[PDB]
Design an enzyme around this catalytic site. Structure first.
Site, mmCIF file in Angstrom:
data_model
loop_
_atom_site.group_PDB
_atom_site.id
_atom_site.type_symbol
_atom_site.label_atom_id
_atom_site.label_comp_id
_atom_site.label_asym_id
_atom_site.label_seq_id
_atom_site.Cartn_x
_atom_site.Cartn_y
_atom_site.Cartn_z
ATOM 1 N N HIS A 68 0.840 -1.229 0.000
ATOM 2 C CA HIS A 68 0.000 0.000 0.000
ATOM 3 C C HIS A 68 0.865 1.266 0.000
ATOM 4 O O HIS A 68 0.681 2.158 0.860
ATOM 5 C CB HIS A 68 -1.010 -0.039 1.135
ATOM 6 C CG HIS A 68 -2.096 -1.017 0.887
ATOM 7 N ND1 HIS A 68 -2.194 -2.188 1.607
ATOM 8 C CD2 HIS A 68 -3.122 -1.010 0.007
ATOM 9 C CE1 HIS A 68 -3.255 -2.856 1.192
ATOM 10 N NE2 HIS A 68 -3.833 -2.158 0.209
ATOM 11 N N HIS A 72 1.874 1.539 -5.769
ATOM 12 C CA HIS A 72 0.462 1.108 -5.888
ATOM 13 C C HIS A 72 -0.408 2.290 -6.357
ATOM 14 O O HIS A 72 -1.240 2.101 -7.258
ATOM 15 C CB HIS A 72 -0.008 0.497 -4.575
ATOM 16 C CG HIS A 72 -1.470 0.266 -4.539
ATOM 17 N ND1 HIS A 72 -2.058 -0.747 -5.232
ATOM 18 C CD2 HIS A 72 -2.458 0.917 -3.898
ATOM 19 C CE1 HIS A 72 -3.357 -0.739 -4.983
ATOM 20 N NE2 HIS A 72 -3.627 0.280 -4.185
ATOM 21 N N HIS A 106 -5.925 7.420 -3.389
ATOM 22 C CA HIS A 106 -6.958 6.532 -2.800
ATOM 23 C C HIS A 106 -6.410 5.796 -1.579
ATOM 24 O O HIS A 106 -7.217 5.295 -0.813
ATOM 25 C CB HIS A 106 -7.517 5.556 -3.852
ATOM 26 C CG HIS A 106 -6.686 4.340 -4.074
ATOM 27 N ND1 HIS A 106 -5.530 4.362 -4.811
ATOM 28 C CD2 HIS A 106 -6.837 3.073 -3.648
ATOM 29 C CE1 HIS A 106 -4.995 3.156 -4.822
ATOM 30 N NE2 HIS A 106 -5.785 2.342 -4.124
ATOM 31 N N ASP A 107 -5.102 5.641 -1.432
ATOM 32 C CA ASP A 107 -4.535 4.907 -0.268
ATOM 33 C C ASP A 107 -3.580 5.812 0.531
ATOM 34 O O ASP A 107 -2.746 5.255 1.277
ATOM 35 C CB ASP A 107 -3.871 3.598 -0.694
ATOM 36 C CG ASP A 107 -4.801 2.396 -0.821
ATOM 37 O OD1 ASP A 107 -5.711 2.243 0.013
ATOM 38 O OD2 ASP A 107 -4.580 1.597 -1.744
ATOM 39 N N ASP A 217 -8.130 -0.766 -8.601
ATOM 40 C CA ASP A 217 -7.524 -1.126 -7.301
ATOM 41 C C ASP A 217 -7.064 -2.576 -7.293
ATOM 42 O O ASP A 217 -6.065 -2.845 -6.614
ATOM 43 C CB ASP A 217 -8.473 -0.891 -6.141
ATOM 44 C CG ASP A 217 -7.742 -0.751 -4.820
ATOM 45 O OD1 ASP A 217 -6.515 -0.509 -4.839
ATOM 46 O OD2 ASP A 217 -8.410 -0.845 -3.790
ATOM 47 N N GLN A 269 -5.994 -18.029 -3.531
ATOM 48 C CA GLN A 269 -6.021 -17.175 -4.755
ATOM 49 C C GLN A 269 -7.208 -17.586 -5.635
ATOM 50 O O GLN A 269 -7.919 -16.665 -6.114
ATOM 51 C CB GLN A 269 -4.695 -17.231 -5.517
ATOM 52 C CG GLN A 269 -3.563 -16.522 -4.783
ATOM 53 C CD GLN A 269 -3.735 -15.023 -4.760
ATOM 54 O OE1 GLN A 269 -3.856 -14.357 -5.785
ATOM 55 N NE2 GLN A 269 -3.783 -14.476 -3.564
HETATM 56 C C1 LIG Z 1 -4.136 -10.617 -6.089
HETATM 57 O O1 LIG Z 1 -3.404 -10.643 -4.860
HETATM 58 C C2 LIG Z 1 -4.040 -11.112 -3.733
HETATM 59 C C3 LIG Z 1 -3.189 -11.558 -2.692
HETATM 60 C C4 LIG Z 1 -3.790 -12.037 -1.513
HETATM 61 C C5 LIG Z 1 -5.191 -12.080 -1.342
HETATM 62 C C6 LIG Z 1 -5.827 -12.651 -0.083
HETATM 63 N N1 LIG Z 1 -6.985 -13.505 -0.419
HETATM 64 C C7 LIG Z 1 -6.855 -14.849 -0.942
HETATM 65 C C8 LIG Z 1 -6.667 -15.886 0.185
HETATM 66 N N2 LIG Z 1 -5.432 -16.317 0.371
HETATM 67 C C9 LIG Z 1 -5.165 -17.267 1.371
HETATM 68 C C10 LIG Z 1 -3.817 -17.680 1.630
HETATM 69 C C11 LIG Z 1 -3.575 -18.655 2.616
HETATM 70 C C12 LIG Z 1 -4.661 -19.233 3.322
HETATM 71 C C13 LIG Z 1 -5.978 -18.830 3.074
HETATM 72 C C14 LIG Z 1 -6.254 -17.853 2.106
HETATM 73 C C15 LIG Z 1 -7.650 -17.402 1.806
HETATM 74 O O2 LIG Z 1 -8.701 -17.949 2.215
HETATM 75 N N3 LIG Z 1 -7.770 -16.261 0.970
HETATM 76 C C16 LIG Z 1 -8.328 -13.096 -0.353
HETATM 77 O O3 LIG Z 1 -8.535 -11.859 -0.407
HETATM 78 N N4 LIG Z 1 -9.332 -14.102 -0.233
HETATM 79 C C17 LIG Z 1 -10.731 -13.862 -0.392
HETATM 80 C C18 LIG Z 1 -11.259 -12.573 -0.049
HETATM 81 C C19 LIG Z 1 -12.612 -12.287 -0.177
HETATM 82 C C20 LIG Z 1 -13.498 -13.274 -0.653
HETATM 83 C C21 LIG Z 1 -14.950 -12.986 -0.794
HETATM 84 C C22 LIG Z 1 -12.986 -14.540 -0.990
HETATM 85 C C23 LIG Z 1 -11.625 -14.853 -0.868
HETATM 86 C C24 LIG Z 1 -5.998 -11.630 -2.376
HETATM 87 C C25 LIG Z 1 -5.430 -11.151 -3.564
HETATM 88 MG MG LIG Z 2 -7.391 1.116 0.151
HETATM 89 ZN ZN LIG Z 3 -5.500 0.469 -3.140
#
Ligand SMILES: COc1ccc(CN(Cc2nc3ccccc3c(=O)[nH]2)C(=O)Nc2ccc(C)cc2)cc1
Ligand SMILES: [Mg+2]
Ligand SMILES: [Zn+2]
Length: 313
Positions: A68, A72, A106-107, A217, A269
């Site tokens: 952040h 970004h 925004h951040d 974002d 992911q």
């Molecule tokens: C693109 O980069 C990125 C990097 C990290 C992340 C983090 N991320 C993925 C995620 N990574 C893990 C890792 C380890 C264990 C468990 C998990 C887990 O359950 N979620 C989310 O935001 N999940 C999510 C959020 C909201 C909803 C609704 C559903 C799923 C996201 C994007």
């Molecule tokens: Mg933000």
């Molecule tokens: Zn952001």
């Protein structure tokens, strides 16, 4: 007035593409932003003396956190630039001005912690702003910087245009609160399907701009695989530090933030692409057809994460 910014040929060409990476040379990011403002908006949109002083104050108020950060800010503004350039006629002169500044800001002053962590910690900001805590802080910081002597890049708007642009920026920054994205996209989905979506309806534009903000974002997931993969490290570096801080408050963090559950990242992911990213860029592509390359890039990266899980990388 007759002073353009110019980029080297490779950047001049690639900057127009959605999947552009702004590169590791920090001292070029301000010039890249000014370039995008000039081509998106006009060489007249802002006094260069004031724009350059606004840009350097904003840069200074971003912190040295893994994700952040200032990079970004500029990455999210480039995605907005690409959206606006591929949708030339759908946006007013005020919206083009407002949204690149909203993206850059925004951040502002992000600490590397979610709204949830501020509330469990009982941070002063969580008393001052009960919902969209950080996002109301980011807009506050934006307004502060605009009111420093010599930083009012909007001075030459009329009183009413000035109030319209600040209002665009406020809704735009609040919309980056991912908790508000789900409902916003469900509404836009229904309105598009039942055929009631109407871009002359201001409440509708607001919703559409909010989804654009979510899409810019999240643009980490719409880059080429090696950028997406290396950005995911920076995001997890913040998340795992927050998970550490949760443990210090005697709260088991969600697995997303627990560095002991790194093994579950590929499956995590998939959930993110399916629950958040794919729906976002799908609804966006439905409303603004020329943003399809974002959806295509996102599906490519989903497919790459599926390959990580199947041991193939
Ligand atoms: C693109 O980069 C990125 C990097 C990290 C992340 C983090 N991320 C993925 C995620 N990574 C893990 C890792 C380890 C264990 C468990 C998990 C887990 O359950 N979620 C989310 O935001 N999940 C999510 C959020 C909201 C909803 C609704 C559903 C799923 C996201 C994007
Ligand atoms: Mg933000
Ligand atoms: Zn952001």
């Amino acid at each position: 007035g007759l002073m353009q910014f110019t980029l080297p040929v490779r950047l001049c060409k690639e900057i127009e593409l959605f999947h552009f990476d702004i590169g590791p040379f920090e001292n070029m990011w301000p010039g890249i932003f000014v370039y995008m403002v000039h081509r998106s908006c006009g060489t007249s949109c802002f006094e260069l003396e004031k724009l350059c002083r606004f840009i350097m104050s904003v840069k200074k108020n971003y912190r040295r956190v893994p994700y952040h950060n200032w990079k970004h800010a500029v990455t999210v503004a480039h995605c907005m630039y690409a959206i606006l350039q591929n949708n030339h006629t759908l946006f007013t002169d005020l919206e083009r001005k407002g949204l690149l500044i909203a993206c850059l800001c925004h951040d502002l002053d992000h600490r590397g912690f979610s709204n949830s962590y501020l509330q469990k910690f009982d941070h002063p900001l969580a008393a001052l702003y009960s919902t969209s805590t950080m996002e109301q802080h980011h807009f506050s910081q934006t307004v502060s910087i605009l009111q420093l002597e010599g930083h009012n890049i909007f001075s030459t708007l009329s009183s009413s245009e000035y109030e319209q642009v600040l209002e665009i920026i406020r809704k735009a920054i609040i919309a980056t609160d991912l908790a508000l994205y789900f409902g916003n996209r469900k509404q836009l989905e229904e309105m598009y399907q039942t055929g009631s979506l109407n871009l002359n309806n201001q409440s509708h534009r607001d919703r559409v701009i909010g989804l654009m903000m979510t899409a810019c974002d999240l643009c980490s997931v719409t880059k080429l695989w090696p950028v997406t993969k290396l950005t995911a490290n920076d995001i997890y570096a913040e998340f795992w530090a927050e998970g550490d801080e949760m443990k210090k408050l005697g709260i088991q963090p969600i697995p997303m933030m627990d560095r002991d559950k790194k093994d579950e990242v590929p499956q995590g992911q998939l959930g993110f692409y399916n629950a958040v990213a794919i729906p976002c860029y799908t609804t966006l592509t439905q409303i603004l057809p020329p943003t399809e390359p974002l959806l295509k890039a996102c599906r490519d990266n989903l497919s790459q994460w599926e390959k990580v899980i199947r041991g193939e990388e």
